[PDB]
């Protein structure tokens, strides 16, 4: 029970994906009656400190679930003691990450308060909350400014103390009326923004602020005040509107979040005084967001100079406008979230209604200053049109403003252009599932017809063999012969030869002009001859054809037995290695790639690079520099990293793991590949290669461009929820660079990486993982199809990665996926078979893999590998902790297992370990049906776009985790070594000097490009404004810009993700 | 209405806001009507009358997301 | 009466033994003559039609004199 209004802040550290615990914590806090401004996850320390200082909050709540917090705590304490934040309480708690030794270190350091897991369990959360709240009983009235110097200068701390005085009424009322007089002499613009809270008005304000920043060159002093209703029961409120604001990145731009603090009134009673304070604070513009509005309230309109109303297409009947007197006084009206149906009709109706109200029959209703807009889509045309209309109104309102530097885009309606998804394309998933059903139906029908024909045939033969002359038999047989389908009859016709061709001990293939004859006989120690693939030996043809249609031989559509007709011959020991600087990594490569014919390198990076984070003098990342991955600053670092390794060699394979800035790294890789050849030719000639030599190098690189990239932006959004770029724009860039590749006929490189590894590690049931992956891949196909690209051109290069768990579902799941994939390619699009064949990678179980009794987990992994061997996996992966070092002991065990599979298993010499079992096919079909059902469920939910928009997969993983953990705790789930058979008896760091050297290299790169930095910025902005294929611009910018600069520019353009959910 | 020996009395409220719950003490039971479109789920913290509505109805079940709306609102009132 | 349905974590119904669903009867008879259900002649699929339900910890134990062996059994067969 605080005497005053207490303000608290909860937030998560940078690079944090898990915030549900802090979410429930903040729920309890606001339930207690605490006013909290939460900033979500991955928030800059400087940004959070600035926000807290400008908002003048009383307490700070911290949840540190990822470690490394100590730097942030120390820096924040130093800054608070530096900027008068010692009296502002700071509280933290992050579970068991803080070791009790670390707890003692923090306590002796001088931390305000750290909550131990033992303390959290014993004392309880409510008691701690009450203790803190009663502890925050501090008087801020002594902090109120006594003079007018701070107010005139614009000290927003002084203005916040003034707001507190207004709340307490302790301000000198004569001084307040004098402030009103000063505002009357000032008269700076005040914009009233009216509409429902959280509808997207924050995104609109963010985009408009960004537009004004770019047009007027960051020259606007913007003061923002938000008033929100107070929960009459609790008395507190969560000021969750500043959180969506991200374009406030300017010291002279200020924002304040406030409550109504009135039991009956929905607005603050001192709001005009706040307006006068902002006007006298020498702010070039004041923007106000209203609270939850009713029907006939129009109190804010006379208190502001311009009125802006926010509306949505959903408003009920058109007669609901007959009761909105607020709209009778709204100077500007905008229809928010134009993505829903009927929006254009409603716009026409409202325009007609306004025309009737104003009796302006001589004017055009569509020309009225009311626009329909969709806030979620970036670069919205209606947003630019409304900004232009606002500029025109300000000119009409007599606003001395700098001339517009932006092109004058015409119109009044956002057209939804650059919409990757075709609006109608959507329910494609149900279409595909129905196609699968129809394929099954047709297969059954054809099998039945062919069986009937065969039965009639043999019956006639026996009867004609019995001597009886019956002409009805041949007529009836012919009735089925024409009924028999042509393609099936062709497949029916092929049975005798292939049956005989594979009956022998050796298969011969005269390929092109040469011949490929390979023996088919395998011999055991007892001398028994083993055919590698043995076919069913049935007599009746109906079931034969049914099998063939449903299950062909390997290498035959739909490649159910695998894509490759015969097993690959052969040690693809993947060389995954990377840490520290270039020198250590190159030494390690020399260790691994010493005298190796085929270079198969796998490259990992630190999250700082994986997040595209520029190295910074802030210690927040300093402990993370060179940790768990190589931090790259410039192209030369990569070129040195690739010194002495002939990447143009066809046996040289490199697999790098990054998703977001991956095109930038690929551009750098192209630079390195070209530079190697150019420098070699220059040394070979003692002269610079000419433009003809440049074109020759270009064509040669296009010929020999080979590589693998582990990029998947989507999966970060599914499990980390840390994505920063709009996935729409990211996939647009993906399409642009893919278009470059097609235009450049890139044929040997691989950049797409679709996986379920984090999906599987999330605890996702395999069926859902499969279905979601299929949806994502086919939506990618549609997007590329929405790009007007031939399906067959890029499908062969499309890649997949899977993780294999324990359930009996995993037994055939890969085969089912292969079977459905081919028919999806064939029926819907009919791309060439080379596109229809699937390539994939398989990973063992990681979710069931645990340090708790890993010894038996190894034997479980044996079972895991069993199926993938029977499933004939083309690529098997065993997870590496690279956390503890992935020691060579595990690799020794895994390679031993692989060799045992390859040789020691005689059953492995067969190539059809699963064909025949009725259990197998029944499991297959039931799994098929279940996957279809899930597809229909997601298709019925508004497609992948809606499922991601609302968080469908979030609920999926939540339910799966809850059910699994309940089975685990109940003991119903039997677990070896945990729930059963209990035991009767029972870190790489880089020197800071290396980081400083790399930082010096990067700054020298900046110093090499500081004079030409303006040219690079202009080039970037030219790429930005036209919304073209940026990679063309990126091809040269990478040579003159660091990746951190690129990310900064991408965030500056407005591509930053706003936590608006 | 009560003294007129009327067996059941029905009242339709006028325009409402976020926190006003004035009619609830003036009535024996409380009923609210809502629609599937709700913007963010945080707006439930704005509806103080939701903490006191004896009954709630989600009109126009036709729009998408209404079922997940049921799930989330049911969880929210469960926590309430 | 013994249930034939088995349930997995995903709730999938599993029949412990599933016969072929062939259409022709000749190959059906061929199989039945060559392979019957468990508990049917010639019991290729095992004598017991249904799997034994159950802890076969065989106590292999003997060494030394009678007294030491009996103490060992006391340890094992307590």
Residue numbers in the entry:
A (entry chain B): 22 to 591, 593 to 904, 907 to 1010, 1019 to 1093
B (entry chain C): 299 to 378
C (entry chain A): 538 to 591, 593 to 616
Sentences from the paper on this structure:
Although most chaperones are standalone proteins, isobutyryl-CoA mutase fused (IcmF) has a G-protein domain covalently attached to its target mutase. IcmF catalyzes the 1,2-rearrangement of isobutyryl-CoA to n-butyryl-CoA, as well as pivalyl-CoA and isovaleryl-CoA, using AdoCbl. Here, we show that the G-protein domain in a fused system forms a similar active conformation, requiring IcmF oligomerization. Cryo-EM structural analysis reveals that the second protomer of the G-protein intermolecular dimer props open the mutase active site using residues of switch III as a wedge, allowing for AdoCbl insertion or damaged Cbl removal.
With 500 μM of the nonhydrolyzable GTP analog, GMPPCP, long chains of IcmF protomers are observed, with all visible IcmF protomers comprising these filamentous-like chains. To further investigate the structures of IcmF’s supramolecular complexes, we prepared cryogenic EM grids and collected datasets of C. metallidurans wt IcmF with GMPPCP and butyryl-CoA (wt IcmF + GMPPCP) and Q341A IcmF with GTP (Q341A IcmF + GTP). For the wt IcmF + GMPPCP dataset, the supramolecular complexes were first manually picked on the micrographs, extracted using helical parameters, and processed as a single particle dataset. Local B factor postprocessing was performed to yield a 6.7-Å resolution reconstruction. For both reconstructions, we observed an open conformation of the mutase active site. In terms of maturation, the formation of the supramolecular complexes made up of apo-IcmF molecules with GMPPCP (right) invokes an assembly line model in which a chain of open mutases can be filled in succession by an ATR that moves down the chain, delivering AdoCbl as it is synthesized.
